[PDB]
């Protein structure tokens with residue numbers, strides 16, 4: 020059984036790395052292909068920035084937001100890991116689209132918070148999840164405190180299956196116009212932060228786009244999509260590995276990518 024091999028290999032990683040590994044893979048309609056701990060809650064950390072960008076694109080599509088609107092800010096908006104926000108600080112603003120692209124592709128925290136300020140805060144992010152059919156994912160705080168990942172805390176969490184289904188809804192389920200869907204996919208493909216994680220474990224000919232996260236207390240996550248030839252999939256990987264170094268957590272997620280690949284290729 021290829022799915023048994025998948026389960027067994029993930030459990031071997033868990034045991035040897037002292038880790039918990041949550042995975043869900045779904046088809047474009049949100050039907051389950053495979054998973055592991057798929058309805059266990061994990062901290063979203065930076066992975067929520069992909070759904071945030073989807074919210075922004077939905078508002079742009081609808082006309083309730085403009086992509087080129089200038090969002091002004093001062094140094095108060097600079098928090099840890101805000102590379103683009105820092106570069107644009109002297110100019111005094113970033114546009115909605117510049118901020119969204121920095122949030123997705125650099126995981127820029129300042130840019131994320133700038134968009135959160137604009138779209139109605141964590142409550143509004145959570146409302147968007149509910150609107151697209153996700154009753155599980157919740158944002159409670161801005162960055163970086165939302166990534167605290169205190170054991171047991173249900174704030175700022177999702178499950179692998181809820182998030183994989185949200186990804187499928189955004190990319191394949193008509194949440195966005197064709198133009199906006201294409202743009203967000205290109206942003207995910209061009210992500211600058213995921214070279215050593217999930218996509219490092221996929222075949223080089225698969226089209227892959229993803230959004231990473233790193234949380235306190237050993238969280239390392241990666242969510243997105245892959246196209247294996249003509250077949251499209253949405254995937255969410257959430258891991259917790261307190262005893263590993265940062266490099267080893269990257270490698271753990273890449274290893275999960277290889278386990279996913281073995282399943283897809285062999286089935």
Ligand SMILES: *C(=O)[C@H]([C@@H](C)O)[C@H]1CC(SCCNC=N)=C(C(=O)O)N1
Nearest residue numbers: 064065100126163166212231232233
């Ligand atoms: C998201 O999970 C965190 C945010 C909560 O601070 C950011 C930080 C990182 S990695 C830290 C250094 N970044 C780049 N060199 C990520 C990430 O996407 O892995 N998101």
Ligand code: NA
Nearest residue numbers: 093094095096
């Ligand atoms: Na300020």
